[PDB]
């Protein structure tokens, strides 16, 4: 009660910190995952067949 405080959504550091967080978790979840380098091979592709 009786409390008035300034706010600044744009100078807020919480958003920056949590963006850095989300980036960190996203990378960390990918570290123990299967590497997919052997996929970069020539692909013999044809068009695909009951398609609108």
């Amino acid at each position: 009660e009786n409390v008035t405080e300034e706010f600044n959504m744009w100078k807020n550091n919480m958003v920056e910190q949590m963006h850095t967080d989300i980036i960190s978790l996203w990378d960390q979840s990918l570290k123990p995952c299967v590497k997919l380098t052997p996929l970069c091979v020539t692909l013999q592709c044809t068009n695909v067949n009951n398609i609108t």
Binding site: T37, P38, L39, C40, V41
Partner: protein, 139 residues
């Protein structure tokens, strides 16, 4: 068609040279073969040197005395004979053909590269043949 060097006569002991030429440079992707035809004895396969320049196979029975060269700049096949015995008195034909470079056992790596591959190539056919050069050896 193909062109071969004219008929030759040689005293036994020395060497002889045979040239097979294509018209211009229209036959470069096809591989090169040399064959021999002893009358009444069928035909023999002298050897071949492929077209990319990675093979030089010559049958061991004729390995010592026979050499096969290819001049890229002039697009000319060279056949050199050294012993020139009585058995070499026959007709030599230059042939242009195609092979099948199949890929046999190959060691891919963990990342998916190609460490090495024997990729032995198989003879398919000899479409184009020279007019034939007669080499006569007389004592």
């Amino acid at each position: 068609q193909l062109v071969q060097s004219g008929p030759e006569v040689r005293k036994p002991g020395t060497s002889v040279k045979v040239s097979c030429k294509a018209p211009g440079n229209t036959l470069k992707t096809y591989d090169l073969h040399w064959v021999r035809s002893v009358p009444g004895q069928g035909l023999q396969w002298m050897g071949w040197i492929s077209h990319e320049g990675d093979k030089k196979v010559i049958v061991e029975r004729f390995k010592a005395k026979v050499t096969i060269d290819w001049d890229r700049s002039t697009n000319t096949a060279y056949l050199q004979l050294s012993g020139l015995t009585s058995g070499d008195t026959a007709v030599y034909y230059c042939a242009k053909g195609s092979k099948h470079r199949l890929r046999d056992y190959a060691l891919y790596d963990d990342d998916g590269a190609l460490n090495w591959a024997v990729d032995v190539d198989y003879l398919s056919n000899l479409e184009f043949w020279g007019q034939g050069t007669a080499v006569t050896v007389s004592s």
